[PDB]
Design a binder for this molecule. Structure first.
Ligand SMILES: Nc1nc2c(ncn2[C@@H]2O[C@H](COP(=O)(O)CP(=O)(O)OP(=O)(O)O)[C@@H](O)[C@H]2O)c(=O)[nH]1
Ligand SMILES: Nc1nc2c(ncn2[C@@H]2O[C@H](COP(=O)(O)OP(=O)(O)OP(=O)(O)O)[C@@H](O)[C@H]2O)c(=O)[nH]1
Ligand SMILES: Nc1ncnc2c1ncn2[C@@H]1O[C@H](COP(=O)(O)OP(=O)(O)NP(=O)(O)O)[C@@H](O)[C@H]1O
Ligand SMILES: [Mg+2]
Ligand SMILES: [Mg+2]
Lengths: 429, 350, 438
């Protein structure tokens, strides 16, 4: 069991979460019938663990939706498997964040907590202990993050067993219409880093690039983008959930990836990633996928992977894995960069393979380890913040929030310290 | 600056006696060094030896060091130069024991009075007189740091509640480092007041119980004394300085079975090991120095940066438990003390 | 008689156990029903049969083995396997606890839960056995749990066993690559503690075995499992030979005892030879001489090594079945030529060479074409030492890093203890090297 309910916070969290649910539910493949598409009983079992059974062996999601506005909740319910999800799990808040970090945080949290306990209990019912909960929210939304943060902090505190991992989209530092928007982000960032030992973010740019190439849409489709993003995330959870010839603890891996709890950042990787036409026409070779993950383009995040190095490297495998492929992976990692592997520990990357290749393409890969670019990205982000400070924007908001302006400075300092340390280490062998 | 630990050796442990093993190190104050047999059984004669500015045998007492240390203590405080003391040793070392010192039984003497009490109590008393001598305004704002899950509780602080977290910001007052301000303390008029208050505070304060030592705090214990001083010189210039002393009783390495600690205690213990290890980490990390500035990130490290190589000044005295048993840990301790040696801290007025 | 049932830890360990057990099962020829399509074995289950599995439901050969499933996944594996079907559910034990594990954390926490259950099972088995000298069990180094189990488990069992030692199986990462950083973390701590407890250790080169299979099969992958099969086969072979009647039968422990004049090298190296491709068999039957050559040649030996590079304080090869006269004749000459072999200072005597009466047997369902002789060799290998050095290098680097303090910290395991373990390992390796040199 040890199923983890996913909680979404922030407008993004809500939006993503719905997709997340859809993806997961799709992963379950459990119809509203509650019949199990998957032949494997076990897979059904995992799903069953994941979601409580409605009659007809339906599975009802366990999660709390963050209600920026009640509409979002309506949206999800309106969206498919509205029946599948049961509103009891659903929490409501018309006010939503109110786009006040403090206000939203304070107001929402009380509402959330009750649901939180209830939901947590359910999971506890499912498995006595859960590895931890992963919540998806928007870091950029100060409010969205802020609301999320409280739950995350509390939950982790409540159970040391659980480890708090968060997904939030980072606003790409590449473009900021204004400093102020990132201002929310910085606040979220500061809170988030403390909140979670490990945090995961995706650059806006990464979304932009990935979406733009794939969609070729002028503006990214939220659903579409969410779909892809959710899928990659789904892969990791799916992989962990699903048995592998060798299985690696997600937590254990998570512990593994960061040499220390300090490094919140994780670099996601999804694959195969190709153009729509490309994927359809041709199938990547196993080694190709591995290479693909290395490539920035394939990776959701945008970076110069060559430029970046991985303090730690890790790979996940799905489908059958070649022994040779492993060696190839090891060799390639060394080949691509010495920096790619940490100097400290040779052959950092370790991979676990699922017994059964993921639905869809048998071969799937995730990217593990962090890149210089992302770390730089953080630094870049803080850069906006400083400008924001110069702006002293959100002065009014800060006042209204009652959040310290000094707190912002503290966030900057802390983030600076962490980023500096991270960068220093990353730069360092 | 930073001082390598002066060693006070715990008298041969009763528990050690239970083992009836000889301590790997022979606690010889004369040596002013201790060595554990590297040869060990293979070579009793052969021993890895560690030297410190002073090393003391079991016969040596915390008091013995304590008096010596005691005098220099006042100076740092009086200046407002932050003073900190850390004791290094295995659990059951008497790291706490020496650190606290012993109050004469039935509190025949207050902590300060007791030579039995460690350096701190005497120095505290001396500070009392010193303040009297100075005639400066001295107030001590007290905050208690009992750390559970890196939570600080101000039992010491006269408020029932634990003091609020001080803001982690470079205090503009403090030139360097990160400073914790906004601390709520209730000052006590006098050191004597401190004596009485401390008694109250102690009751408030608790340590995680340890089977290995009830005495031993399971959690890392952090006792902080803040002294606000204001005087008007012969010049008549009015000078205001703030002195601060952190007396830290870190938990030693523990294993659950040995500890007999509660699992939660163990959870504390994991923190316990982590903290020290983190601290171990600091010297080895220490070197790169640019930029990804390797210091502040941990709370402990954060305090630490101020502590050593920071605005606050600390000195290290180590007391050890005779037991060889935590050889790795003790070795870690000894090595760590050396590790500490690498970086020295500059004293500064708070 | 004495019966040993392996305990396998970790997914890999369990997986190995499954393969080994299954291989045994194939040998037994007993259906998953537990009633053999074959007739009842002579003496009921053979002594070997009893040894591997206690016999219950007589007239039916139902294996008994103890498996621990830290993860429920393992349980599924167990249940999935035929053997479980034969096995009474009592035999199977699953830990409630997750693996989880941090390597340090897992063993202590997990072990306690397992130990009580296992001990009871063990005792009953011991009761079943006339007497149990010790248990042979497989554990996975790479898994934190797998490594963890061995250390904790071994001591307790050793205590229970008393003088008679247990044989331990371990997974040794090839020095070339490590599956994960974590494993080497496990390695030192587990190894140092374990080694003292264990009379011997079994070393396998995960990569090497894969490679060895890889060459003959000429398929690197798929499958890993296939590689596993060979591993199961080799391990099965050695035990099998002992299990099988022999004109001279030596207990493994005795043999290993013979192998190392000193406890210093608790663990014999494990080798399998000759390796034969199926195709090669098709081309021709292996000659005894070819067997002899194959056995020597480092490719054949499980760990890749340069025979010069490695030193064998003693090298022996146990052979299944009947050692052919040829095989024997060829051997002296080989040993003679081989510079590489080291000497003990004292005395040239003390060994045994040994033949099993029973004719050579091929494990059924062998992926590879059957070899007339399957052999293992116990020796001291450089590769282990080099792996040790490699691990040491990484470990020291890790030490410098002070990385993954937190994991250990979570365990509450001492860093100092860890460093001590490293030191001990270094001491052991250095001592081992020192002793190794004449
Ligand atoms: N990658 C994505 N970024 C998004 C998405 N929706 C918004 N955003 C980004 O997130 C930021 C806006 O935060 P939110 O969506 O969470 C708004 P929130 O509920 O937190 O607060 P309010 O401003 O009070 O509505 C901004 O930088 C957007 O560019 C999305 O679906 N994906
Ligand atoms: N002998 C053998 N080793 C294997 C096999 N597959 C993987 N391994 C090795 O086993 C180690 C991993 O240990 P596992 O037993 O799978 O893990 P675990 O002990 O259950 O612990 P976690 O999975 O981390 O919770 C790695 O060094 C792998 O290289 C196999 O079929 N046979
Ligand atoms: N100098 C001493 N004379 C007599 N007893 C001592 C002395 N030093 C330590 N002890 C005893 O050993 C037990 C204490 O361990 P202490 O409480 O000294 O361990 P500690 O350093 O605080 N352990 P830890 O908290 O884990 O870091 C106490 O009950 C003391 O009475
Ligand atoms: Mg104590
Ligand atoms: Mg496992």
């Amino acid at each position: 069991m040890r199923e983890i309910v996913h909680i979404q916070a922030g407008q993004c969290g809500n939006q993503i979460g719905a997709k997340f649910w859809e993806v997961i539910s799709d992963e379950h493949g459990i119809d509203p019938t509650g019949s199990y598409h998957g032949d494997s009983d076990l897979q059904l079992e995992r799903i069953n663990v994941y979601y409580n059974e409605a009659a007809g062996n339906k599975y009802v999601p366990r999660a709390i939706l963050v209600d920026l506005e009640p509409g979002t909740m309506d949206s999800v319910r309106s969206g498919p498997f509205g029946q599948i999800f049961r509103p009891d799990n659903f929490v409501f808040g018309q006010s939503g964040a109110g786009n006040n970090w403090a206000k939203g945080h304070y107001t929402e949290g009380a509402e959330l907590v009750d649901s939180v306990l209830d939901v947590v209990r359910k999971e506890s019912e499912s498995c006595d202990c859960l590895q931890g909960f992963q919540l998806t929210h928007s870091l950029g939304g100060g409010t969205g993050s802020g609301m999320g943060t409280l739950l995350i902090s509390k939950i982790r505190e409540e159970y040391p067993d659980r480890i708090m991992n968060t997904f939030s989209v980072v606003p790409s530092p590449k473009v900021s219409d204004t400093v102020v928007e990132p201002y929310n982000a910085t606040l979220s960032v500061h809170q988030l880093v403390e909140n979670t030992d490990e945090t995961y973010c995706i650059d806006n740019e990464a979304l932009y690039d990935i979406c733009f190439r794939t969609l070729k849409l002028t503006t990214p489709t939220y659903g579409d983008l969410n779909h892809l993003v959710s899928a990659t995330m789904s892969g990791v959870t799916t992989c962990l959930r699903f048995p592998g010839q060798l299985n690696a603890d997600l937590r254990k891996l998570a512990v593994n990836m960061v040499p220390f709890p300090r490094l919140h950042f994780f670099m996601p990787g999804f694959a195969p990633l190709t153009s729509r036409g490309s994927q359809q026409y041709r199938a990547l070779t196993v080694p190709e996928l591995t290479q693909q993950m290395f490539d920035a383009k394939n990776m959701m995040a945008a970076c110069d992977p060559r430029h970046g190095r991985y303090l730690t490297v890790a790979a996940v495998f799905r489908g059958r894995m070649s022994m040779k492929e492993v060696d190839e992976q090891m060799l390639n990692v060394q080949n691509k960069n010495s920096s790619y592997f940490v100097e400290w520990i040779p052959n950092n990357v370790k991979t676990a393979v699922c017994d059964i290749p993921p639905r869809g393409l048998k071969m799937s890969a995730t990217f593990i380890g962090n890149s210089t670019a992302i770390q730089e990205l953080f630094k870049r982000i803080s850069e906006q913040f400083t400008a924001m400070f110069r702006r002293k924007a959100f002065l009014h908001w800060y006042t209204g929030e009652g959040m310290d302006e000094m707190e912002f400075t503290e966030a900057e300092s802390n983030m600076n310290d962490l980023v500096s340390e991270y960068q220093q280490y990353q730069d360092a062998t | 600056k930073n001082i390598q630990v002066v060693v006070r050796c715990r008298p041969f442990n009763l528990a050690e006696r239970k083992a009836s093993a000889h301590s790997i190190v022979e606690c010889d104050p004369v040596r002013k060094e201790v060595s554990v047999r590297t040869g060990g059984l293979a070579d009793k004669s052969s021993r890895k030896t560690y030297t410190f500015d002073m090393v003391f045998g079991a016969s040596t007492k915390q008091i013995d060091v304590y008096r010596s240390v005691v005098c220099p203590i006042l100076d740092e405080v009086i200046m407002g130069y932050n003073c900190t003391i850390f004791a290094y040793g295995q659990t059951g070392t008497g790291k706490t024991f020496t650190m606290e010192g012993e109050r004469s039984p039935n509190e025949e003497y207050t902590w300060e009075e007791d030579p039995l009490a460690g350096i701190i109590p005497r120095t505290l008393h001396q500070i009392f007189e010193k303040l009297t001598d100075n005639g400066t305004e001295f107030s001590v704002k007290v905050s208690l740091l009992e750390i559970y899950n890196e939570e600080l509780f101000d039992l010491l602080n006269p408020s029932s509640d634990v003091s609020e977290r001080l803001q982690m910001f470079d205090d503009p007052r403090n030139k360097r480092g990160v400073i914790i301000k906004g601390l709520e303390e209730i000052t006590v008029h006098n050191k004597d007041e401190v004596y009485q208050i401390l008694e109250k505070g102690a009751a408030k304060r608790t340590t995680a119980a340890t089977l290995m030592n009830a005495y031993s705090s399971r959690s890392h214990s952090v006792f902080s004394v803040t002294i606000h001083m204001k005087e008007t010189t012969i010049d008549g210039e009015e000078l205001v300085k703030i002195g601060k002393l952190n007396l830290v009783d870190l938990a030693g390495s523990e294993n659950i079975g040995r500890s007999g600690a509660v699992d939660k205690r163990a959870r504390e213990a994991g923190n316990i090991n982590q903290s020290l290890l983190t601290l171990g980490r600091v010297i080895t990390a220490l070197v790169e120095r640019t930029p990804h500035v390797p210091y502040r990130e941990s709370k402990l490290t954060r305090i630490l940066q101020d502590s050593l190589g920071g605005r606050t000044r600390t000195s290290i005295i180590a007391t050890i438990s005779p037991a060889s048993l935590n050889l790795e840990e003790t070795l870690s301790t000894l090595e760590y003390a050396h590790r500490a040696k690498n970086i020295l801290n500059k004293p500064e007025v708070n | 008689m004495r019966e040993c049932i392996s305990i396998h830890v970790g997914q890999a360990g369990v997986q190995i156990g499954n393969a080994c057990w299954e291989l045994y099962c194939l040998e037994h020829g007993i259906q998953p029903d537990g009633q053999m399509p074959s007739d009842k074995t002579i003496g009921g289950g053979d002594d070997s049969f009893n040894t591997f599995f206690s016999e219950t439901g007589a007239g039916k050969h139902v294996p008994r083995a103890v498996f621990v499933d830290l993860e429920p996944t393992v349980i599924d594996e167990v249940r999935t396997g035929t053997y479980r079907q034969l096995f009474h559910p009592e035999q199977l034990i699953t830990g409630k606890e997750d693996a989880a594990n941090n390597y340090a954390r897992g063993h202590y926490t997990i072990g306690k839960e397992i130990i009580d259950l296992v001990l009871d099972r063990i005792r009953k088995l011991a009761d079943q056995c006339t007497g149990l000298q010790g248990f042979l069990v497989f554990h996975s180094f790479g898994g934190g749990t797998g490594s963890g189990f061995t250390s904790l488990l071994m001591e307790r069992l050793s205590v229970d066993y008393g003088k008679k030692s247990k044989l331990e199986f371990s997974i040794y990462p090839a020095p070339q690559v490590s599956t994960a950083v974590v494993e080497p973390y496990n390695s030192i701590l587990t190894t140092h503690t374990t080694l003292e407890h264990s009379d011997c250790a079994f070393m396998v080169d995960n990569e090497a075995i894969y490679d060895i299979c890889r060459r003959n099969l000429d398929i690197e992958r798929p499958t890993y499992t296939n590689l596993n099969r060979l591993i199961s086969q080799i391990v099965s072979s050695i035990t099998a030979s002992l299990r099988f009647d022999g004109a001279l039968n030596v207990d493994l422990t005795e043999f290993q005892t013979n192998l190392v004049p000193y406890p210093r090298i608790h663990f014999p190296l494990a080798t399998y030879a000759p390796v034969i491709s199926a195709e090669k068999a098709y081309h021709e039957q292996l000659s005894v001489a070819e067997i002899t050559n194959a056995c020597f040649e480092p490719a054949n030996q499980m760990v890749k090594c340069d025979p010069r590079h490695g030193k064998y304080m003693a090298c022996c090869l146990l052979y299944r079945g009947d050692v052919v006269p040829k095989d024997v004749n060829a051997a002296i000459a080989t040993i003679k030529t081989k510079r590489s072999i080291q000497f003990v200072d004292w005395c040239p005597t003390g060994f045994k060479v040994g033949i099993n009466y029973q004719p050579p047997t091929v494990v059924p369902g062998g992926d590879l074409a059957k070899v007339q002789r399957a052999v293992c060799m116990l020796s001291n290998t450089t590769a282990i030492a080099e792996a040790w050095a490699r691990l040491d290098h990484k470990f020291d680097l890790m030490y410098a890093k002070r990385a993954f303090v937190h994991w250990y910290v979570g365990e509450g395991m001492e860093e100092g203890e860890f460093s001590e373990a490293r030191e001990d390992m270094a001491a052991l390796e250095k001592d081992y090297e020192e002793v190794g040199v004449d």
